[PDB]
Write a protein that binds this DNA or RNA. Structure first.
Ligand SMILES: [Zn+2]
Ligand SMILES: [Zn+2]
Ligand SMILES: [Zn+2]
Length: 89
DNA sequence: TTCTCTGTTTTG
DNA sequence: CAAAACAGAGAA
């Protein structure tokens, strides 16, 4: 199997490629930058970025497809917890 | 709660 | 295939 060599997280990963990508966890480097003017937030992960951006735009893209629901959510986490505790879609 | 992290799945 | 998106975990 695929295992992180860093003593302290001997975590196991489905792929080797993601074993490489995983290493950013252990660096303090934060390559990805917020694109919003004068915001100094940084990330290691694009998905963090993507979602962070909607705090600036206030967008609420996740829209419940279930009839007589129609709540919306900014982040995926909220939508997944939601259908978990409702069973919609 | 609101928001970020991260491992795996899905997408194009 | 890799980039995007998911799902649920983790911070605050
Ligand atoms: Zn590790
Ligand atoms: Zn920002
Ligand atoms: Zn719903």
């Amino acid at each position: 199997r695929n295992i992180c060599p860093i003593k302290g997280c001997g975590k196991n990963f489905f792929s080797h490629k993601y074993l490489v990508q995983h290493q950013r966890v252990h660096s303090d480097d934060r390559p990805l930058k917020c694109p919003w003017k004068g915001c100094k937030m940084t990330f290691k992960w694009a998905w963090s970025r993507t979602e962070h951006i909607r705090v600036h735009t206030g967008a609420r893209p996740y829209v419940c497809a279930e009839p007589d629901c129609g709540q919306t959510f900014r982040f995926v986490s909220d939508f997944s917890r939601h259908k978990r505790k409702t069973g919609h879609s």
